[PDB]
């Protein structure tokens, strides 16, 4: 209604410089944050493989009866894993 007609008076005790600075900084921060939240999701568009994958794909390593990769019988160092 006509109850909002005197809202400009807001700027007689809230100043423009600090307000503009705060707004701009906050908007950039929010932009970066939302892009990173959507990237870390199922909606990720850089890594989805649409329209095509461009890098080579992961290759699994076969395991032994203990569930970890097999040792190689003359290697002078054990084999790496990442899961334990």
């Amino acid at each position: 209604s006509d109850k909002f007609a005197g809202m400009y008076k807001l700027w007689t005790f809230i100043d423009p410089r600090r307000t503009l600075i705060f707004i701009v900084a906050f908007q950039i921060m929010l932009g970066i944050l939302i892009h990173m939240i959507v990237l870390g999701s199922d909606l990720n568009w850089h890594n989805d493989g649409i329209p095509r994958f461009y890098s080579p794909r992961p290759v699994d390593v076969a395991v032994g009866p203990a569930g970890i990769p097999l040792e190689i019988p003359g290697s002078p160092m054990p084999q790496a894993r990442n899961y334990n």
């Binding site: 040792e71 019988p73 003359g74 290697s75 002078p76 160092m77 054990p78």
Partner: protein, 66 residues
């Protein structure tokens, strides 16, 4: 790898209790220590600083005597 080490312990005890220490009667005084007991077996007696002795080349299958 913790589960083989658990067996290793027991294995070494066998080697030392049943076989090597009773040989203290047969060997000369050259093969004994200050307290008069023979030399015994450790983890280092076969690993010798590797995660498997000789990096795990299977030598023993070719000999049916062992």
């Amino acid at each position: 790898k913790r589960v083989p080490a658990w067996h290793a312990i027991r294995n070494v005890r066998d080697i030392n209790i049943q076989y090597v220490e009773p040989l203290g009667e047969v060997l000369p005084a050259s093969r004994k220590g200050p307290l008069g007991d023979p030399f015994k077996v450790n983890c280092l007696t076969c690993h010798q600083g590797a995660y498997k002795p000789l990096f795990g080349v299977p030598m023993a299958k070719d000999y049916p005597a062992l």
